[PDB]
Amino acid sequence: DALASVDGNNAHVEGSRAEDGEMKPTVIKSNVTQILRKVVRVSDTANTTA
Amino acid sequence: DALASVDGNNAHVEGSRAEDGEMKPTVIKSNVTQILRKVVRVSDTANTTA
Amino acid sequence: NYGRGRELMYQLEKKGKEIKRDLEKILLSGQARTDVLADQYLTNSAADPA
Protein backbone atom coordinates (compact mmCIF):
# COMPACT_ATOMS: atom_id res chain seq x y z
CA ASP A 1 0.00 0.00 0.00
CA ALA A 2 0.97 3.66 -0.28
CA LEU A 3 -0.46 6.76 1.35
CA ALA A 4 -2.33 9.10 -0.96
CA SER A 5 -0.49 12.04 -2.48
CA VAL A 6 0.01 15.18 -0.42
CA ASP A 7 -2.93 16.73 -2.29
CA GLY A 8 -2.16 20.27 -1.20
CA ASN A 9 -4.43 23.29 -1.69
CA ASN A 10 -7.11 21.46 0.29
CA ALA A 11 -8.64 24.50 1.98
CA HIS A 12 -12.20 24.12 3.28
CA VAL A 13 -14.87 26.14 5.09
CA GLU A 14 -15.18 26.23 8.87
CA GLY A 15 -18.76 24.96 8.65
CA SER A 16 -19.90 23.11 5.53
CA ARG A 17 -20.77 19.68 4.17
CA ALA A 18 -18.12 16.98 4.62
CA GLU A 19 -17.35 15.84 1.09
CA ASP A 20 -17.08 12.13 0.37
CA GLY A 21 -13.28 12.37 0.39
CA GLU A 22 -11.11 9.93 -1.52
CA MET A 23 -9.32 6.62 -1.02
CA LYS A 24 -6.95 4.29 -2.86
CA PRO A 25 -6.77 0.47 -2.76
CA THR A 26 -3.73 -1.73 -2.25
CA VAL A 27 -1.51 -3.45 -4.83
CA ILE A 28 -0.86 -7.19 -5.02
CA LYS A 29 2.58 -8.55 -5.94
CA SER A 30 3.05 -12.26 -6.62
CA ASN A 31 5.95 -14.52 -7.55
CA VAL A 32 6.46 -18.17 -8.46
CA THR A 33 8.91 -20.86 -7.38
CA GLN A 34 11.68 -22.48 -9.40
CA ILE A 35 12.76 -26.13 -9.48
CA LEU A 36 16.41 -27.08 -8.94
CA ARG A 37 17.56 -30.64 -9.54
CA LYS A 38 20.78 -32.64 -9.59
CA VAL A 39 21.60 -36.18 -10.72
CA VAL A 40 24.23 -38.74 -9.72
CA ARG A 41 24.70 -41.88 -11.84
CA VAL A 42 27.37 -44.24 -10.49
CA SER A 43 27.78 -47.88 -11.49
CA ASP A 44 28.71 -50.60 -9.02
CA THR A 45 31.51 -51.48 -11.44
CA ALA A 46 33.05 -48.09 -10.63
CA ASN A 47 31.87 -48.19 -7.00
CA THR A 48 33.74 -51.45 -6.36
CA THR A 49 37.34 -50.35 -5.80
CA ALA A 50 38.75 -47.94 -3.22
CA ASP B 1 8.12 48.88 14.12
CA ALA B 2 11.81 48.58 13.26
CA LEU B 3 14.00 51.69 13.39
CA ALA B 4 14.33 54.18 10.54
CA SER B 5 17.02 54.42 7.88
CA VAL B 6 20.27 55.93 9.11
CA ASP B 7 20.69 59.62 8.25
CA GLY B 8 24.32 60.07 7.23
CA ASN B 9 23.70 63.82 6.79
CA ASN B 10 22.46 64.47 10.34
CA ALA B 11 24.21 67.84 10.43
CA HIS B 12 22.45 70.89 11.87
CA VAL B 13 23.20 74.46 12.89
CA GLU B 14 23.87 75.53 16.47
CA GLY B 15 20.95 77.97 16.59
CA SER B 16 18.36 76.23 14.42
CA ARG B 17 14.82 75.18 15.26
CA ALA B 18 13.55 71.62 14.95
CA GLU B 19 11.92 70.54 11.69
CA ASP B 20 8.44 69.18 10.92
CA GLY B 21 6.89 66.21 12.70
CA GLU B 22 7.74 62.56 12.09
CA MET B 23 4.31 60.95 11.84
CA LYS B 24 4.83 57.25 11.11
CA PRO B 25 2.18 54.50 10.86
CA THR B 26 1.69 51.45 13.10
CA VAL B 27 2.06 48.80 10.38
CA ILE B 28 0.82 45.39 11.54
CA LYS B 29 1.50 41.95 10.07
CA SER B 30 -1.40 39.50 10.10
CA ASN B 31 -2.34 36.05 8.86
CA VAL B 32 -5.34 33.71 8.82
CA THR B 33 -5.79 30.05 9.69
CA GLN B 34 -6.53 27.29 7.19
CA ILE B 35 -8.97 24.40 7.57
CA LEU B 36 -7.57 20.99 6.63
CA ARG B 37 -10.10 18.18 6.26
CA LYS B 38 -9.79 14.46 5.54
CA VAL B 39 -13.00 12.47 5.00
CA VAL B 40 -13.29 8.70 4.76
CA ARG B 41 -16.53 6.80 4.05
CA VAL B 42 -16.44 2.99 4.12
CA SER B 43 -19.52 0.80 3.83
CA ASP B 44 -20.38 -1.37 6.82
CA THR B 45 -20.32 -4.51 4.66
CA ALA B 46 -16.67 -3.91 3.79
CA ASN B 47 -16.05 -3.49 7.53
CA THR B 48 -17.28 -7.04 8.26
CA THR B 49 -15.09 -8.91 5.76
CA ALA B 50 -11.71 -10.38 6.70
CA ASN C 1 -53.17 3.21 21.04
CA TYR C 2 -55.57 0.52 22.23
CA GLY C 3 -54.01 -2.70 20.95
CA ARG C 4 -50.38 -1.57 20.88
CA GLY C 5 -47.90 0.84 22.43
CA ARG C 6 -45.69 3.08 20.31
CA GLU C 7 -46.09 3.37 16.55
CA LEU C 8 -42.37 2.58 16.12
CA MET C 9 -41.79 -0.62 18.09
CA TYR C 10 -44.94 -2.08 16.53
CA GLN C 11 -43.84 -1.25 12.98
CA LEU C 12 -40.32 -2.58 13.57
CA GLU C 13 -41.70 -5.97 14.60
CA LYS C 14 -43.86 -5.97 11.46
CA LYS C 15 -40.77 -5.33 9.34
CA GLY C 16 -38.85 -8.08 11.13
CA LYS C 17 -41.45 -10.47 9.74
CA GLU C 18 -41.77 -9.01 6.24
CA ILE C 19 -38.01 -9.40 5.79
CA LYS C 20 -38.38 -13.13 6.44
CA ARG C 21 -41.25 -13.50 3.97
CA ASP C 22 -39.34 -11.70 1.21
CA LEU C 23 -36.27 -13.74 2.15
CA GLU C 24 -38.06 -17.07 1.70
CA LYS C 25 -39.59 -15.86 -1.56
CA ILE C 26 -36.12 -14.86 -2.77
CA LEU C 27 -34.38 -18.08 -1.74
CA LEU C 28 -37.03 -20.02 -3.70
CA SER C 29 -37.21 -17.63 -6.68
CA GLY C 30 -35.54 -18.08 -10.06
CA GLN C 31 -33.22 -15.08 -10.00
CA ALA C 32 -30.04 -15.68 -12.01
CA ARG C 33 -27.57 -14.17 -9.50
CA THR C 34 -27.62 -10.70 -11.02
CA ASP C 35 -24.18 -9.27 -10.26
CA VAL C 36 -21.62 -7.06 -11.97
CA LEU C 37 -19.27 -10.06 -11.85
CA ALA C 38 -20.25 -13.06 -14.00
CA ASP C 39 -17.75 -15.83 -13.19
CA GLN C 40 -15.30 -13.01 -12.40
CA TYR C 41 -15.19 -13.62 -8.63
CA LEU C 42 -11.84 -15.40 -8.85
CA THR C 43 -11.44 -14.26 -12.48
CA ASN C 44 -11.68 -10.53 -11.78
CA SER C 45 -9.36 -7.83 -13.10
CA ALA C 46 -5.63 -8.14 -12.41
CA ALA C 47 -3.88 -6.70 -9.35
CA ASP C 48 -5.13 -3.31 -10.56
CA PRO C 49 -8.91 -3.07 -9.93
CA ALA C 50 -9.69 -1.60 -13.35
CSV table of N, CA and C in Angstrom, one decimal:
chain,number,residue,atom,x,y,z
A,1,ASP,N,0.8,-1.2,0.0
A,1,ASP,CA,0.0,0.0,0.0
A,1,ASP,C,0.9,1.2,0.0
A,2,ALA,N,0.3,2.4,-0.3
A,2,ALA,CA,1.0,3.7,-0.3
A,2,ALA,C,0.0,4.8,0.1
A,3,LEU,N,0.4,5.6,1.0
A,3,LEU,CA,-0.5,6.8,1.4
A,3,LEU,C,-0.7,7.6,0.1
A,4,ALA,N,-1.9,8.2,0.1
A,4,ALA,CA,-2.3,9.1,-1.0
A,4,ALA,C,-1.4,10.3,-1.1
A,5,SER,N,-1.4,10.9,-2.2
A,5,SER,CA,-0.5,12.0,-2.5
A,5,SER,C,-0.8,13.1,-1.5
A,6,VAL,N,0.2,14.1,-1.4
A,6,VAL,CA,0.0,15.2,-0.4
A,6,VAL,C,-1.3,15.9,-0.7
A,7,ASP,N,-1.7,16.1,-1.9
A,7,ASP,CA,-2.9,16.7,-2.3
A,7,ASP,C,-3.1,18.1,-1.6
A,8,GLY,N,-2.1,19.0,-1.8
A,8,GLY,CA,-2.2,20.3,-1.2
A,8,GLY,C,-3.4,21.1,-1.6
A,9,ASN,N,-3.3,22.4,-1.4
A,9,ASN,CA,-4.4,23.3,-1.7
A,9,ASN,C,-5.8,22.7,-1.4
A,10,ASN,N,-5.9,22.1,-0.2
A,10,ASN,CA,-7.1,21.5,0.3
A,10,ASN,C,-7.9,22.3,1.3
A,11,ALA,N,-7.9,23.6,1.1
A,11,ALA,CA,-8.6,24.5,2.0
A,11,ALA,C,-10.1,24.2,2.0
A,12,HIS,N,-10.8,24.4,3.1
A,12,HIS,CA,-12.2,24.1,3.3
A,12,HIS,C,-12.8,25.3,4.1
A,13,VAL,N,-14.1,25.2,4.3
A,13,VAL,CA,-14.9,26.1,5.1
A,13,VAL,C,-15.0,25.7,6.5
A,14,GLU,N,-15.1,26.6,7.5
A,14,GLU,CA,-15.2,26.2,8.9
A,14,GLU,C,-16.4,25.4,9.1
A,15,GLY,N,-17.6,25.8,8.6
A,15,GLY,CA,-18.8,25.0,8.6
A,15,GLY,C,-19.4,24.7,7.3
A,16,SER,N,-19.4,23.5,6.8
A,16,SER,CA,-19.9,23.1,5.5
A,16,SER,C,-20.1,21.6,5.5
A,17,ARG,N,-20.5,21.1,4.3
A,17,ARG,CA,-20.8,19.7,4.2
A,17,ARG,C,-19.5,18.9,4.0
A,18,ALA,N,-19.3,17.8,4.7
A,18,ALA,CA,-18.1,17.0,4.6
A,18,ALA,C,-18.2,16.2,3.3
A,19,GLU,N,-17.4,16.5,2.4
A,19,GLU,CA,-17.4,15.8,1.1
A,19,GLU,C,-17.0,14.4,1.3
A,20,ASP,N,-17.3,13.6,0.3
A,20,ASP,CA,-17.1,12.1,0.4
A,20,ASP,C,-15.6,11.8,0.5
A,21,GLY,N,-14.7,12.7,0.3
A,21,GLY,CA,-13.3,12.4,0.4
A,21,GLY,C,-12.8,11.5,-0.8
A,22,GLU,N,-11.7,10.8,-0.5
A,22,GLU,CA,-11.1,9.9,-1.5
A,22,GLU,C,-10.3,8.9,-0.8
A,23,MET,N,-10.1,7.7,-1.5
A,23,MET,CA,-9.3,6.6,-1.0
A,23,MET,C,-8.6,6.0,-2.2
A,24,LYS,N,-7.7,5.0,-1.9
A,24,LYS,CA,-6.9,4.3,-2.9
A,24,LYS,C,-6.7,2.9,-2.4
A,25,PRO,N,-6.9,1.9,-3.2
A,25,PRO,CA,-6.8,0.5,-2.8
A,25,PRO,C,-5.3,0.1,-2.7
A,26,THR,N,-5.1,-1.2,-2.3
A,26,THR,CA,-3.7,-1.7,-2.2
A,26,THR,C,-3.3,-2.3,-3.6
A,27,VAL,N,-2.1,-2.8,-3.6
A,27,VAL,CA,-1.5,-3.4,-4.8
A,27,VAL,C,-1.0,-4.8,-4.4
A,28,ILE,N,-1.2,-5.8,-5.3
A,28,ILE,CA,-0.9,-7.2,-5.0
A,28,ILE,C,0.3,-7.5,-5.9
A,29,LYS,N,1.4,-8.1,-5.3
A,29,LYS,CA,2.6,-8.6,-5.9
A,29,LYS,C,2.8,-10.0,-5.7
A,30,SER,N,2.9,-10.8,-6.7
A,30,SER,CA,3.0,-12.3,-6.6
A,30,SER,C,4.3,-12.7,-7.4
A,31,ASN,N,4.8,-13.9,-6.9
A,31,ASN,CA,6.0,-14.5,-7.6
A,31,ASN,C,5.7,-16.0,-7.6
A,32,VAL,N,6.6,-16.7,-8.3
A,32,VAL,CA,6.5,-18.2,-8.5
A,32,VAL,C,7.8,-18.8,-8.1
A,33,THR,N,7.7,-20.1,-7.8
A,33,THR,CA,8.9,-20.9,-7.4
A,33,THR,C,9.6,-21.5,-8.6
A,34,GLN,N,10.9,-21.8,-8.4
A,34,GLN,CA,11.7,-22.5,-9.4
A,34,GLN,C,12.2,-23.8,-8.9
A,35,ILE,N,12.4,-24.8,-9.8
A,35,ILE,CA,12.8,-26.1,-9.5
A,35,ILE,C,14.2,-26.3,-9.8
A,36,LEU,N,15.0,-26.7,-8.8
A,36,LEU,CA,16.4,-27.1,-8.9
A,36,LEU,C,16.6,-28.6,-8.7
A,37,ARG,N,17.4,-29.2,-9.5
A,37,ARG,CA,17.6,-30.6,-9.5
A,37,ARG,C,19.0,-31.0,-9.9
A,38,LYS,N,19.5,-32.1,-9.3
A,38,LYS,CA,20.8,-32.6,-9.6
A,38,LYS,C,20.6,-34.1,-9.8
A,39,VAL,N,21.6,-34.8,-10.4
A,39,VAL,CA,21.6,-36.2,-10.7
A,39,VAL,C,23.0,-36.8,-10.4
A,40,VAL,N,23.0,-38.0,-10.0
A,40,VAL,CA,24.2,-38.7,-9.7
A,40,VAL,C,24.1,-40.2,-10.2
A,41,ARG,N,24.7,-40.5,-11.3
A,41,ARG,CA,24.7,-41.9,-11.8
A,41,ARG,C,26.1,-42.5,-11.6
A,42,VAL,N,26.1,-43.6,-10.8
A,42,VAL,CA,27.4,-44.2,-10.5
A,42,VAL,C,27.1,-45.7,-10.5
A,43,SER,N,27.9,-46.4,-11.3
A,43,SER,CA,27.8,-47.9,-11.5
A,43,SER,C,28.6,-48.6,-10.4
A,44,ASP,N,28.0,-49.8,-10.0
A,44,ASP,CA,28.7,-50.6,-9.0
A,44,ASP,C,30.1,-51.0,-9.5
A,45,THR,N,30.2,-51.2,-10.9
A,45,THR,CA,31.5,-51.5,-11.4
A,45,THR,C,32.5,-50.4,-11.1
A,46,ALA,N,32.1,-49.2,-11.1
A,46,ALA,CA,33.0,-48.1,-10.6
A,46,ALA,C,33.1,-48.0,-9.1
A,47,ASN,N,31.9,-48.2,-8.5
A,47,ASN,CA,31.9,-48.2,-7.0
A,47,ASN,C,32.2,-49.6,-6.4
A,48,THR,N,33.3,-50.1,-6.8
A,48,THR,CA,33.7,-51.4,-6.4
A,48,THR,C,35.1,-51.3,-5.7
A,49,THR,N,36.0,-50.5,-6.3
A,49,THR,CA,37.3,-50.3,-5.8
A,49,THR,C,37.3,-49.3,-4.7
A,50,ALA,N,38.5,-49.0,-4.2
A,50,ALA,CA,38.7,-47.9,-3.2
A,50,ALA,C,39.8,-47.0,-3.7
B,1,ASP,N,7.8,47.5,14.1
B,1,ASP,CA,8.1,48.9,14.1
B,1,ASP,C,9.6,49.1,14.2
B,2,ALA,N,10.4,48.4,13.3
B,2,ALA,CA,11.8,48.6,13.3
B,2,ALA,C,12.2,50.0,13.1
B,3,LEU,N,13.5,50.3,13.4
B,3,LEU,CA,14.0,51.7,13.4
B,3,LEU,C,14.0,52.2,12.0
B,4,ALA,N,14.3,53.5,11.8
B,4,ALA,CA,14.3,54.2,10.5
B,4,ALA,C,15.7,54.1,9.9
B,5,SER,N,15.8,54.4,8.6
B,5,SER,CA,17.0,54.4,7.9
B,5,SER,C,18.0,55.4,8.4
B,6,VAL,N,19.3,55.0,8.6
B,6,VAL,CA,20.3,55.9,9.1
B,6,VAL,C,20.4,57.2,8.3
B,7,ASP,N,20.6,58.3,8.9
B,7,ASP,CA,20.7,59.6,8.2
B,7,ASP,C,22.2,60.0,8.3
B,8,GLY,N,22.9,59.7,7.3
B,8,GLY,CA,24.3,60.1,7.2
B,8,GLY,C,24.6,61.6,7.2
B,9,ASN,N,23.6,62.4,6.9
B,9,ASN,CA,23.7,63.8,6.8
B,9,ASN,C,23.0,64.5,8.0
B,10,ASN,N,23.1,63.9,9.1
B,10,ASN,CA,22.5,64.5,10.3
B,10,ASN,C,23.3,65.6,10.9
B,11,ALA,N,23.5,66.6,10.1
B,11,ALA,CA,24.2,67.8,10.4
B,11,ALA,C,23.2,69.0,10.5
B,12,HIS,N,23.4,69.8,11.6
B,12,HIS,CA,22.5,70.9,11.9
B,12,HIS,C,23.3,72.1,12.4
B,13,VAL,N,22.6,73.2,12.4
B,13,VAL,CA,23.2,74.5,12.9
B,13,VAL,C,23.1,74.5,14.4
B,14,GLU,N,23.9,75.4,15.0
B,14,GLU,CA,23.9,75.5,16.5
B,14,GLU,C,22.7,76.3,17.0
B,15,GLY,N,22.1,77.2,16.2
B,15,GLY,CA,20.9,78.0,16.6
B,15,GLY,C,19.7,77.8,15.7
B,16,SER,N,19.5,76.6,15.3
B,16,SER,CA,18.4,76.2,14.4
B,16,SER,C,17.2,75.6,15.2
B,17,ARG,N,16.0,75.8,14.7
B,17,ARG,CA,14.8,75.2,15.3
B,17,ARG,C,14.5,73.8,14.7
B,18,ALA,N,13.9,73.0,15.4
B,18,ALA,CA,13.5,71.6,14.9
B,18,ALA,C,12.7,71.7,13.7
B,19,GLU,N,12.7,70.6,12.9
B,19,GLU,CA,11.9,70.5,11.7
B,19,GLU,C,10.5,70.0,11.9
B,20,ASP,N,9.8,69.7,10.8
B,20,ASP,CA,8.4,69.2,10.9
B,20,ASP,C,8.3,67.9,11.7
B,21,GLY,N,7.1,67.4,12.0
B,21,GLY,CA,6.9,66.2,12.7
B,21,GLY,C,7.4,65.0,12.0
B,22,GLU,N,7.3,63.8,12.6
B,22,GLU,CA,7.7,62.6,12.1
B,22,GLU,C,6.6,61.5,12.2
B,23,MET,N,5.4,61.9,11.8
B,23,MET,CA,4.3,61.0,11.8
B,23,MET,C,4.6,59.7,11.0
B,24,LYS,N,4.7,58.6,11.7
B,24,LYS,CA,4.8,57.3,11.1
B,24,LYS,C,3.6,56.3,11.4
B,25,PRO,N,3.3,55.4,10.6
B,25,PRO,CA,2.2,54.5,10.9
B,25,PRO,C,2.5,53.5,11.9
B,26,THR,N,1.6,52.5,12.1
B,26,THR,CA,1.7,51.4,13.1
B,26,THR,C,1.5,50.1,12.4
B,27,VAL,N,2.2,49.9,11.3
B,27,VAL,CA,2.1,48.8,10.4
B,27,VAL,C,2.0,47.5,11.2
B,28,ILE,N,1.0,46.7,10.9
B,28,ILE,CA,0.8,45.4,11.5
B,28,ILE,C,0.9,44.3,10.5
B,29,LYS,N,1.5,43.1,10.9
B,29,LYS,CA,1.5,42.0,10.1
B,29,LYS,C,0.5,40.9,10.6
B,30,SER,N,-0.3,40.4,9.7
B,30,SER,CA,-1.4,39.5,10.1
B,30,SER,C,-1.5,38.3,9.2
B,31,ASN,N,-2.2,37.3,9.6
B,31,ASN,CA,-2.3,36.0,8.9
B,31,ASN,C,-3.7,35.4,9.3
B,32,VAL,N,-4.1,34.4,8.6
B,32,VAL,CA,-5.3,33.7,8.8
B,32,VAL,C,-5.1,32.2,8.8
B,33,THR,N,-5.9,31.5,9.6
B,33,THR,CA,-5.8,30.1,9.7
B,33,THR,C,-6.3,29.4,8.4
B,34,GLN,N,-6.1,28.1,8.3
B,34,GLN,CA,-6.5,27.3,7.2
B,34,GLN,C,-7.1,26.0,7.7
B,35,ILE,N,-8.2,25.6,7.1
B,35,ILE,CA,-9.0,24.4,7.6
B,35,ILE,C,-8.5,23.2,6.7
B,36,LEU,N,-8.0,22.2,7.3
B,36,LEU,CA,-7.6,21.0,6.6
B,36,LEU,C,-8.5,19.9,7.0
B,37,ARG,N,-9.1,19.2,6.0
B,37,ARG,CA,-10.1,18.2,6.3
B,37,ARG,C,-9.7,16.9,5.5
B,38,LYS,N,-10.1,15.8,6.1
B,38,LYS,CA,-9.8,14.5,5.5
B,38,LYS,C,-11.0,13.6,5.9
B,39,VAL,N,-11.8,13.3,4.8
B,39,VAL,CA,-13.0,12.5,5.0
B,39,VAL,C,-12.8,11.1,4.5
B,40,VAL,N,-13.4,10.1,5.1
B,40,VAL,CA,-13.3,8.7,4.8
B,40,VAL,C,-14.6,8.0,5.0
B,41,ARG,N,-15.2,7.5,4.0
B,41,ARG,CA,-16.5,6.8,4.1
B,41,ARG,C,-16.4,5.4,3.6
B,42,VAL,N,-16.6,4.4,4.4
B,42,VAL,CA,-16.4,3.0,4.1
B,42,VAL,C,-17.7,2.3,4.5
B,43,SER,N,-18.3,1.5,3.6
B,43,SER,CA,-19.5,0.8,3.8
B,43,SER,C,-19.3,-0.2,5.0
B,44,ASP,N,-20.4,-0.5,5.7
B,44,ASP,CA,-20.4,-1.4,6.8
B,44,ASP,C,-20.1,-2.8,6.4
B,45,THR,N,-20.6,-3.2,5.2
B,45,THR,CA,-20.3,-4.5,4.7
B,45,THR,C,-18.8,-4.7,4.5
B,46,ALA,N,-18.1,-3.8,3.9
B,46,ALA,CA,-16.7,-3.9,3.8
B,46,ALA,C,-16.0,-4.0,5.1
B,47,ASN,N,-16.6,-3.5,6.2
B,47,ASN,CA,-16.0,-3.5,7.5
B,47,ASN,C,-16.2,-4.8,8.2
B,48,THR,N,-17.1,-5.7,7.7
B,48,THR,CA,-17.3,-7.0,8.3
B,48,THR,C,-16.4,-8.1,7.6
B,49,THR,N,-15.9,-7.9,6.4
B,49,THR,CA,-15.1,-8.9,5.8
B,49,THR,C,-13.8,-9.1,6.5
B,50,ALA,N,-13.0,-10.1,6.1
B,50,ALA,CA,-11.7,-10.4,6.7
B,50,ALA,C,-10.6,-10.4,5.6
C,1,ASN,N,-52.3,4.0,21.9
C,1,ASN,CA,-53.2,3.2,21.0
C,1,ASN,C,-53.7,2.1,21.9
C,2,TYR,N,-54.9,1.5,21.4
C,2,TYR,CA,-55.6,0.5,22.2
C,2,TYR,C,-54.8,-0.8,22.2
C,3,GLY,N,-54.6,-1.4,21.0
C,3,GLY,CA,-54.0,-2.7,20.9
C,3,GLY,C,-52.5,-2.7,20.6
C,4,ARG,N,-51.8,-1.7,21.1
C,4,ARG,CA,-50.4,-1.6,20.9
C,4,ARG,C,-49.9,-0.4,21.7
C,5,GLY,N,-48.5,-0.2,21.7
C,5,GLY,CA,-47.9,0.8,22.4
C,5,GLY,C,-47.5,2.0,21.5
C,6,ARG,N,-46.2,2.0,21.2
C,6,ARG,CA,-45.7,3.1,20.3
C,6,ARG,C,-45.8,2.6,18.9
C,7,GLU,N,-46.0,3.6,18.0
C,7,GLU,CA,-46.1,3.4,16.5
C,7,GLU,C,-44.8,3.1,15.9
C,8,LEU,N,-43.7,2.9,16.7
C,8,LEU,CA,-42.4,2.6,16.1
C,8,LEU,C,-42.0,1.1,16.4
C,9,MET,N,-42.1,0.8,17.7
C,9,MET,CA,-41.8,-0.6,18.1
C,9,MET,C,-42.7,-1.6,17.4
C,10,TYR,N,-44.0,-1.2,17.2
C,10,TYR,CA,-44.9,-2.1,16.5
C,10,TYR,C,-44.6,-2.3,15.1
C,11,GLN,N,-44.2,-1.2,14.4
C,11,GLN,CA,-43.8,-1.3,13.0
C,11,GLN,C,-42.5,-2.0,12.8
C,12,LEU,N,-41.6,-1.8,13.7
C,12,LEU,CA,-40.3,-2.6,13.6
C,12,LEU,C,-40.6,-4.1,13.6
C,13,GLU,N,-41.4,-4.5,14.5
C,13,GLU,CA,-41.7,-6.0,14.6
C,13,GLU,C,-42.4,-6.4,13.3
C,14,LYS,N,-43.2,-5.6,12.7
C,14,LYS,CA,-43.9,-6.0,11.5
C,14,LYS,C,-42.8,-6.1,10.4
C,15,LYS,N,-41.8,-5.2,10.3
C,15,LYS,CA,-40.8,-5.3,9.3
C,15,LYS,C,-39.9,-6.5,9.6
C,16,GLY,N,-39.6,-6.9,10.8
C,16,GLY,CA,-38.9,-8.1,11.1
C,16,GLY,C,-39.5,-9.3,10.6
C,17,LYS,N,-40.8,-9.3,10.3
C,17,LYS,CA,-41.5,-10.5,9.7
C,17,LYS,C,-41.5,-10.4,8.2
C,18,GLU,N,-41.7,-9.2,7.7
C,18,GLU,CA,-41.8,-9.0,6.2
C,18,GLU,C,-40.4,-9.4,5.6
C,19,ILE,N,-39.3,-9.1,6.3
C,19,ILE,CA,-38.0,-9.4,5.8
C,19,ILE,C,-37.8,-10.9,5.6
C,20,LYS,N,-38.5,-11.7,6.5
C,20,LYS,CA,-38.4,-13.1,6.4
C,20,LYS,C,-39.2,-13.6,5.3
C,21,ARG,N,-40.4,-13.1,5.1
C,21,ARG,CA,-41.2,-13.5,4.0
C,21,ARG,C,-40.6,-13.2,2.6
C,22,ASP,N,-40.1,-12.0,2.4
C,22,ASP,CA,-39.3,-11.7,1.2
C,22,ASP,C,-38.1,-12.6,1.1
C,23,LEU,N,-37.4,-12.9,2.2
C,23,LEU,CA,-36.3,-13.7,2.2
C,23,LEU,C,-36.6,-15.1,1.6
C,24,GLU,N,-37.6,-15.8,2.2
C,24,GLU,CA,-38.1,-17.1,1.7
C,24,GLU,C,-38.4,-17.0,0.2
C,25,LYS,N,-39.2,-16.0,-0.2
C,25,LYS,CA,-39.6,-15.9,-1.6
C,25,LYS,C,-38.4,-15.7,-2.5
C,26,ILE,N,-37.3,-15.1,-2.0
C,26,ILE,CA,-36.1,-14.9,-2.8
C,26,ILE,C,-35.3,-16.1,-2.9
C,27,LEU,N,-35.1,-16.8,-1.7
C,27,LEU,CA,-34.4,-18.1,-1.7
C,27,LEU,C,-35.0,-19.1,-2.6
C,28,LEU,N,-36.3,-19.1,-2.9
C,28,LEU,CA,-37.0,-20.0,-3.7
C,28,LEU,C,-37.4,-19.4,-5.1
C,29,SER,N,-36.9,-18.3,-5.4
C,29,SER,CA,-37.2,-17.6,-6.7
C,29,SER,C,-36.3,-18.2,-7.8
C,30,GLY,N,-36.3,-17.6,-8.9
C,30,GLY,CA,-35.5,-18.1,-10.1
C,30,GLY,C,-34.5,-17.0,-10.5
C,31,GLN,N,-34.2,-16.1,-9.6
C,31,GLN,CA,-33.2,-15.1,-10.0
C,31,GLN,C,-31.9,-15.7,-10.4
C,32,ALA,N,-31.2,-15.1,-11.4
C,32,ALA,CA,-30.0,-15.7,-12.0
C,32,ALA,C,-28.8,-15.1,-11.4
C,33,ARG,N,-28.8,-14.7,-10.2
C,33,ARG,CA,-27.6,-14.2,-9.5
C,33,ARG,C,-27.1,-12.9,-10.2
C,34,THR,N,-28.0,-12.0,-10.4
C,34,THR,CA,-27.6,-10.7,-11.0
C,34,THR,C,-26.5,-10.0,-10.2
C,35,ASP,N,-25.3,-9.9,-10.9
C,35,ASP,CA,-24.2,-9.3,-10.3
C,35,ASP,C,-23.3,-8.7,-11.4
C,36,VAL,N,-22.5,-7.7,-11.0
C,36,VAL,CA,-21.6,-7.1,-12.0
C,36,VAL,C,-20.6,-8.1,-12.4
C,37,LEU,N,-20.3,-9.0,-11.6
C,37,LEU,CA,-19.3,-10.1,-11.8
C,37,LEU,C,-20.0,-11.4,-12.2
C,38,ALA,N,-19.7,-11.8,-13.5
C,38,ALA,CA,-20.2,-13.1,-14.0
C,38,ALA,C,-19.1,-14.0,-14.2
C,39,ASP,N,-18.9,-14.9,-13.2
C,39,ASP,CA,-17.8,-15.8,-13.2
C,39,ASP,C,-16.4,-15.1,-13.0
C,40,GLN,N,-16.5,-13.8,-12.6
C,40,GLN,CA,-15.3,-13.0,-12.4
C,40,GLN,C,-14.9,-12.9,-10.9
C,41,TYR,N,-15.5,-13.7,-10.0
C,41,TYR,CA,-15.2,-13.6,-8.6
C,41,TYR,C,-13.7,-13.9,-8.4
C,42,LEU,N,-13.3,-15.1,-8.8
C,42,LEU,CA,-11.8,-15.4,-8.8
C,42,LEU,C,-11.2,-15.1,-10.2
C,43,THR,N,-11.9,-14.6,-11.2
C,43,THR,CA,-11.4,-14.3,-12.5
C,43,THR,C,-11.6,-12.8,-12.7
C,44,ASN,N,-11.5,-12.0,-11.7
C,44,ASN,CA,-11.7,-10.5,-11.8
C,44,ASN,C,-10.5,-9.9,-12.5
C,45,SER,N,-10.5,-8.6,-12.5
C,45,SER,CA,-9.4,-7.8,-13.1
C,45,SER,C,-8.1,-8.2,-12.4
C,46,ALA,N,-6.9,-7.8,-13.0
C,46,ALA,CA,-5.6,-8.1,-12.4
C,46,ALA,C,-5.4,-7.3,-11.1
C,47,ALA,N,-4.2,-7.4,-10.6
C,47,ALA,CA,-3.9,-6.7,-9.3
C,47,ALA,C,-4.4,-5.3,-9.3
C,48,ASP,N,-4.6,-4.6,-10.5
C,48,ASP,CA,-5.1,-3.3,-10.6
C,48,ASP,C,-6.6,-3.4,-10.7
C,49,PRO,N,-7.5,-3.0,-9.8
C,49,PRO,CA,-8.9,-3.1,-9.9
C,49,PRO,C,-9.4,-2.1,-11.0
C,50,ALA,N,-9.2,-2.5,-12.3
C,50,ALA,CA,-9.7,-1.6,-13.3
C,50,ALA,C,-11.2,-1.5,-13.4
